[PDB]
């Protein structure tokens, strides 16, 4: 009965969703810790955790790392993160003792700009190429190098994205993607931070609702 | 009679110079091509070639690569090269079919600045730390990863550095360092470029006497 990643990968995206619907109905009833426990018990390959080290990143990092100590933490350095994020990554990595795995584009940001100009200023196709070089290519290489088959991420339905209907389990980039805190609201996030002695990203106090790259 | 790198490495720097003086007197009589030929024949380990892809870089690159096809070419991307240098590297790599090996700091330039500020604006100690992160650490890692025992560089005595008395052969970073065109003047450089259909770095035409990082 254990889900077969290879078989699932052979089905159209639409059909993968139908195949996981039942599993997702049961995962939805568990809490974040139990969802992580279930994945570790029923999902394959190497387990990895990714984070953008944004405003509320401390929650997913602490929660998953507590259950799976030294789990590889994939960070995609675009070369354009806020300086506060870099120091936040350094701080959290040291505090939670994260097995950090930094991945970056094939060449430096200066090299990229020398070749293509400022891609984020070139409409939809530029932004698309930028993400491919700085986020998509590096992450795919990471999953491969780390032999990942199960990937934990800290996405939440209530964040400003097309994530309102995201399930706990899905297949993405050819691997199982697990979202333990997919249903957490801001109150639950705060309570978790308070309880475990964690903090929001430093730019929260400068009024940043979210953080990524800065130009 | 072949020089012993391990034995030489065990001697004080001053004594290494005395041990190579005789070899250097004979190498001085050969031309650049013969100096390269001699090293390939009498020096050990893997052979590597480094270049900063500056104004006259095409000469040493073409000359050594012609004698030793696909020789690893070490480029130390500081993340702050002129955009013209990046395009120059791309162009030369494609034209001469260089076996380019790009090495960079442990983390991105943005990350470095987040941690230490702009090191090149912090006096002698800042510049020293900057070079250690962006030039020294990467090059040492390259020599190691590539298993280098002999290293070719395109230095010339007449350039604006303490290079006026540089010999053809020396020991640096624990390996033999060979400077085939150590005695070439600007006339010889130009004639070589003309003859082989090569060009100066594009910024020469914008009046740059030399190029490195830009801030």
Swiss-Prot record, chains A, B:
Indicate whether Oxidoreductase appears among the record's keywords: yes
Q: Can you state which reaction this protein catalyses?
A: [thioredoxin]-disulfide + sulfite + adenosine 3',5'-bisphosphate + 2 H(+) = [thioredoxin]-dithiol + 3'-phosphoadenylyl sulfate
Q: Which InterPro entries match?
A: PAPS/APS_Rdtase, PAPS_reduct_dom, PAPS_reductase_CysH, Rossmann-like_a/b/a_fold
Activity regulation annotation text: Severely inhibited by reagents which covalently modify Cys groups in proteins.
Q: Which domain of life is it from?
A: Bacteria
Give this protein's Gene Ontology molecular function annotations.
phosphoadenylyl-sulfate reductase (thioredoxin) activity
**EC number(s) on file:** 1.8.4.8
According to its record, what are the GO cellular component terms? cytoplasm
Q: Where found, per UniProt?
A: Cytoplasm
Residues crossing the lipid bilayer are none
Please give the chief subcellular localization of this protein.
Answer: cytoplasm
Key words of the record: Cytoplasm, Oxidoreductase
Pathway note: Sulfur metabolism; hydrogen sulfide biosynthesis; sulfite from sulfate: step 3/3
Q: Its Gene Ontology biological processes?
A: hydrogen sulfide biosynthetic process; sulfate assimilation, phosphoadenylyl sulfate reduction by phosphoadenylyl-sulfate reductase (thioredoxin); sulfur compound metabolic process
Of which family is this protein a member? Belongs to the PAPS reductase family. CysH subfamily.
Q: What is known of its domains?
A: The open, reduced form of PAPS reductase is able to bind PAPS, whereas the closed oxidized form cannot. A movement between the two monomers of the dimer may allow this switch in conformation to occur.
Matching NCBIfam families, A to Z? Answer: cysH, PAPS_reductase, PRK02090.1
User: What is the protein named?
Assistant: Phosphoadenosine 5'-phosphosulfate reductase
Q: Which organism is it from?
A: Escherichia coli (strain K12)
Q: Which gene encodes it?
A: cysH
